[PDB]
Design a protein around this ligand. Structure first.
Ligand SMILES: [Ca+2]
Ligand SMILES: [Ca+2]
Ligand SMILES: [Ca+2]
Ligand SMILES: [Ca+2]
Ligand SMILES: [Mn+2]
Ligand SMILES: [Mn+2]
Ligand SMILES: [Mn+2]
Ligand SMILES: [Mn+2]
Lengths: 229, 229, 229, 229
C-alpha cells in the first residue's frame, strides 16, 4: 500500500512543491491567485493552473487496485459585476506532464485529453446548462453530472471532494459558511478507464474572453490524501 | 493543541472502545446494529445508541478555543415495506454521561437536553417537515435546518459531516453510491452555547412504535477526527 | 482494521480523556505531574498514574491479529540532590480496569499482574542492575532487557517507543536534546501472551520511600497511535 | 502551516513519485535496490540514489520557521563475505536538484556540497572511526557524531530518524528485530545553516571499489512526515 498526503493552510509565495502554470502565482499574503489581477482588479483572457509536485498513483494495472482519495479546499471568485462573469475554476486530475489547454470556457483543461475535473462554472457556454453549476467532467468540457450553483460573489466557498474506489463514486460539495448554504453532486467515474495509472492533481481557472466578463479565482488552502491498497 | 482520531472499517463484536446503550449490538460480521432484529427482521419499540469511549474536547473556556471535527460513516436503513417506516438514525454529540432519552420520534436523543445531532429521519412527526429529511438539530427534536432526503431502502449511504469552528458551520452530506445521488445541508451552530466543553460522540436510532413501522439502522464503518487549537 | 490515535502538546488542567490515578494531576501550565509536589518541591511516598480514556485493541483471538503501535512523549525528572533519587517513571499497558499497585520500587505497576512497561528507573533495588536504567518489563518489576541510562537532572527527555507486531519487537529510546545524548533498548515481547486483548495505556511514577530520595516525574506532551489489521 | 507525508509498504517497480538516480531500481517484488545486482549477487563500483518527488519545505527565511520531521524505513545490507564489505547506505536531505556525487567511500553524497545525512557505513575510510558505524553528517563525509554499529549480514534493520526543530536535535536509531538489538545516535544540527529552504529527501548507497568488497543495499519500506509551522 501507498499513502500520499499534504496540507496547506496557506501557500508560500515561492512555492516549491506547487507547479505553477500560465498566469498562476502566490500572493505575498499566501493566496493562490490562478488568474491575473492588476491594480487589485481581475483581467480578461487569463488562464492559470497549479499542480502538486508529486504524482499520485491512482490505479495499478499489475495489481488491479484503484485509489480512493479525499480533498478539501476553500476558494473565492470575485467579480466587479455580479450578473456578468466568466469562466470558472476546477479541481482536476491529469497525466503528470499535463500542460494548459484552451482558455475561456475550456477552463484551461480541455480543447476543441485525459482529465477528470470538478468544475465551478460561472458562464453558460454551448455545452452548459443555463445556470451556473458545479459539474463532474470526464474527459470532456461537457459535464456528465451537475448541480445548479448559486454563486456568491466574493464569499469563501468550502469544497470537499471524495472518490470511493470500491463504488467508483466521485462526490463534490460546496458550502458558503457565510450563510450556511450548500450544494452537492455525485457521479459514477471509472478512473482506470478515464486516466493513466499516475496523475498530477491541482486546480485550473480562466477569466472571460471579454472585459465585462472578468473575475478572480483564488484558492486559500488545500489538503489532500490518497491511498492505493 | 489536542488531536483525537479513530477509524473502524468494521466493528468488533465485543467492542471495548464503543459504549453500547439500549438495544445496540455488533453482529458477528461486524455491523453496528443499533435497533433490534429478530429472525433477520426489524422489531418495533427499539432504541439503541453507541458512543466512542474517549470524550472529545470541543471547547475550552479558559483558552477561548473551539474544536473543528470531521467524520465519515456508512449506514443502511432497511424496511420490509418502503412506504411505512420509522423512525431514523442520527450522529450526535452530548455530555459524556449521556444516557438514552425517549424512543420513537425522539430518536433516543431528546424528550418532552444538551445534544447536537445530524438526523436521518424516516417518519414525519408533528415537529417535522412532510418528507423524509436530513436535519441539523440543536438541543431540540425540531431541526433548525433540513434537506429533503430520498431514502433508498437497503442501500448503503455514505455520510460526511464537518464542523469548521472559525465559521461555526456544521455541514452534513449523504450519498448513495448505488445511483450516485446526493444531498447536503448546513447550519450555523455555536458549540460553546449548545454543549459543554467535553462531549461524547456517536449514533442513536429508534424503530417505530408500531409493527407496520419497522426498519433496521445499521452502521458499517466510522472514522472521526477532532482538533482543538 | 482499526486505527486509534491522539496527540497532546500539553495537558488540560481538568483532563477528561485522561484517567488520573493516585497523586497524579495536571498543573495550571499543563504539565502532567505524576508525583506530589509541595511548595515546588517533590514529596516522598507518592504514586501517580495517568491512562488514556479509550481502551486500545492490541490483539484479537478470533482474527489472530496483533496491533503495532508507536508513541512519543517528553518527561522531566528533577531531584534536589543528584546522587540520591527514587524511584522512577514508566509508560505501560495493562488491563482496562487497572488500578495502582505498589509504591516505591514497584513504580505503581507491580506487586509482591498483567502489565508491560518501559521504565526509567532512578533507584537500584534488589531486582535491578547497579546503574540507573531504561528497562523493558513483561509482567515483572524485573526487566528482561535494559540499558544503562545517564539520567540528567531536570533536563527534558524525549522518548520514542514502537512495537512491531510482525516481529514481536518492542523498542524504546531516550534522547536529551540539551546535549544530544541518547540511549536505546529492545526486546522480543509477545503481547498476546503477556496481556489481554484490550488494554489501557499511560504512565506511572513513584517517589522514594524516604525524604532524601525524592524527585518529580512530569510528562510534558504525548502522542500515540495504534493499528490492528 | 504545511504538512507533507507519505508511506510505502513496498515500492512500485516503475515508481513515479520516486526519482531514481544512478544504478537504483525497484525489483519486481517491490524492493528498492540501490546498488547493482547481477545473477542475484552484488557488483562493485555501483552507486544508486532515490528521492521523493515533492520537495520538502524545511525552513522559511521570511517567517523564521524550521520544520520538524520523522521517518521510518527498513533496509538490508547483504555481503557474500561478512569480513569484507563496502561501502554503505544513507538517508539524506539535499537541494532539490541534487545529483549523484562520488562513489565508493563518498556514498554518492559527497566529494573531494549541501547535504545532511544519516549514514550506515560498512567500511573504514581515512575519515572514519575503526568500526562500522551509524553517523550523522553535516556537509561532510566525516561524521560529527557516530555510534559503533554491529552490522548483521542480511538481517532486516528498522530505522527511525527524527528532527525536532525547537531543539535542533537530529536522532537516528537502528534495530535488528531478529535479535532485538539496537543502536542510537544524536546530534545538534542547524538545518537553516546547513541546507537551503527547500530540499529533496531519500537514500543513497555505494558498493565497494573492489570485487572483494561488495554488498547489497536494499530498502524495503519507507514512511516520512514533515510539518512547517
Ligand atoms: Ca462554462
Ligand atoms: Ca421524525
Ligand atoms: Ca528501581
Ligand atoms: Ca566509510
Ligand atoms: Mn460547465
Ligand atoms: Mn426530523
Ligand atoms: Mn528497574
Ligand atoms: Mn563514515
Amino acid at each position: 500500500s501507498e499513502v500520499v498526503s499534504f496540507s496547506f493552510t496557506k501557500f508560500n509565495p515561492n512555492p516549491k512543491d506547487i507547479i505553477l502554470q500560465g498566469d498562476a502565482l502566490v500572493t505575498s499574503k499566501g493566496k493562490l491567485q490562478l488568474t491575473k489581477v492588476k491594480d487589485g482588479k481581475p483581467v480578461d483572457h487569463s488562464l492559470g493552473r497549479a499542480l502538486y509536485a508529486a504524482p499520485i498513483h491512482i490505479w495499478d494495472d499489475s495489481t488491479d487496485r484503484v485509489a480512493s482519495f479525499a480533498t478539501s479546499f476553500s476558494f473565492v471568485v470575485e467579480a466587479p459585476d455580479e450578473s456578468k462573469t466568466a469562466d470558472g475554476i476546477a479541481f482536476f486530475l491529469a497525466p503528470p506532464d499535463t500542460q494548459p489547454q484552451k482558455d475561456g470556457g475550456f477552463l484551461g483543461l480541455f480543447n476543441d485529453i485525459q482529465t477528470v475535473a470538478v468544475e465551478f462554472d460561472t458562464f453558460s457556454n454551448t455545452w452548459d446548462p443555463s445556470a451556473r453549476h458545479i459539474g463532474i467532467n470526464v474527459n470532456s468540457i461537457e459535464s456528465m453530472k451537475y448541480v445548479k450553483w448559486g454563486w456568491e460573489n466574493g464569499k469563501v466557498a468550502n469544497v470537499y471532494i471524495s472518490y470511493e474506489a470500491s463504488t467508483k463514486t466521485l462526490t463534490a460539495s460546496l458550502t458558503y459558511p457565510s450563510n450556511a448554504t450548500s450544494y452537492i453532486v455525485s457521479a459514477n467515474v471509472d478512473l482506470k478507464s478515464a486516466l493513466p495509472e499516475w496523475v498530477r492533481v491541482g486546480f485550473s481557472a480562466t477569466s472571460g474572453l471579454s472585459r465585462d466578463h472578468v473575475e478572480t479565482h483564488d484558492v486559500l488552502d488545500w489538503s489532500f490524501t490518497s491511498t492505493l491498497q
